[PDB]
């Protein structure tokens, strides 16, 4: 048995829990459960590599890791220049002496 | 808001286009333009921290290639109450 | 104020930012925002000839980087008086 079960998140985190994943055992829920294009997927990765062979790429990494002007690691959302968020490009390469914000 | 955005330049074309950037970027009111002297002219604007930041970004991007260009810019966020008489 | 300016975008928000460019560029009265259908969105403004000319020039300059981007931008100087009831 070993009620403690190690399951690897889609990004690569080890969580020891009980999980909900697939197995050759109890049936009625296999039905080809592999398709994965959903935000906040709590479905374990182990299901995907063991039973599907297709590993999606993770989400829910809301933490945005930035480097403060003094070269140290800040994070928590982030309010700089996103590559895909447009209409904020101008000024990206300018100096803002004072209370740091980017 | 009370955050202090503010721009320095040489000439009034850059000064007023920086003011236009102020008033087109974010919800920021200018507390005043000033003729510093020797050609130096500055603009002082009040608004929210993110608001004044967007404003100063716009002013810097639209200012450096106008006339002589931007000379200085700075982003005071909490101006102490003792500084208000100076503005 | 009679000169009518008008533009499409392959998407709603490019049209919205186009209208933003209109109003931040020159004095314009955005009279209409219309859904063409399937994604095309039109915005139409009113103003002076040179005013709308410069406004739409700025809008087209600032539009191509927004989503799919600009699709059509040309303007008229003397609108026909019977069209606006249909607009």
């Amino acid at each position: 048995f070993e009620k403690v079960g190690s399951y690897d998140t889609l990004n690569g985190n080890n969580v020891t829990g009980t999980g909900v994943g697939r197995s050759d055992y109890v049936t009625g829920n296999e039905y080809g459960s592999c398709k994965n294009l959903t935000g906040d997927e709590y479905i374990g990765s182990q299901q995907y590599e063991k039973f599907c062979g297709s590993t999606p790429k993770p989400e829910a990494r809301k933490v945005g890791l930035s480097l403060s002007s003094k070269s140290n690691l800040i994070s928590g959302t982030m309010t700089g220049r996103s590559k895909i968020v447009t209409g904020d490009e101008p000024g990206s390469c300018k100096v803002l002496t004072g209370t740091p914000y980017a | 808001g009370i955050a202090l955005g503010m721009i320095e330049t040489r000439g009034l074309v850059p000064a007023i286009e920086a003011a236009d950037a102020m008033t087109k970027a974010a919800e920021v009111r200018l507390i005043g333009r000033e003729f510093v002297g020797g050609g130096y002219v500055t603009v002082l604007v009040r608004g929210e921290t993110g608001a004044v930041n967007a404003a100063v970004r716009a002013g810097a991007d639209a200012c450096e290639r106008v006339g002589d260009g931007l000379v200085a810019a700075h982003i005071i966020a909490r101006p102490h109450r003792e500084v208000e008489p100076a503005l | 104020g009679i000169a009518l300016g008008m533009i499409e975008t392959r998407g709603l928000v490019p049209a919205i930012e186009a209208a933003d460019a209109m109003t931040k560029a020159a004095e314009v009265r955005l009279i209409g925002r219309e859904f063409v259908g399937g994604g095309y969105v039109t915005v139409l403004v009113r103003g002076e000839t040179g005013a709308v000319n410069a406004a739409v020039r700025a809008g087209a300059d600032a539009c191509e980087r927004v989503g799919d981007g600009l699709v059509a931008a040309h303007i008229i100087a003397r609108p026909h008086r019977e069209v606006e009831p249909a607009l």
């Binding site: 490009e89 101008p90 | 236009d20 716009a58 639209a62 290639r65 | 460019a21 300059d61």
Partner: peptide
């Protein structure tokens, strides 16, 4: 001078001058 958008870049009129104006 950044994207045209807000500020026109180097729109000459007769001879040389940028005359970007507003």
């Amino acid at each position: 001078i950044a994207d045209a958008s807000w500020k026109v870049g180097k729109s000459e009129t007769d001879s040389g001058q940028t005359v970007t104006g507003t």
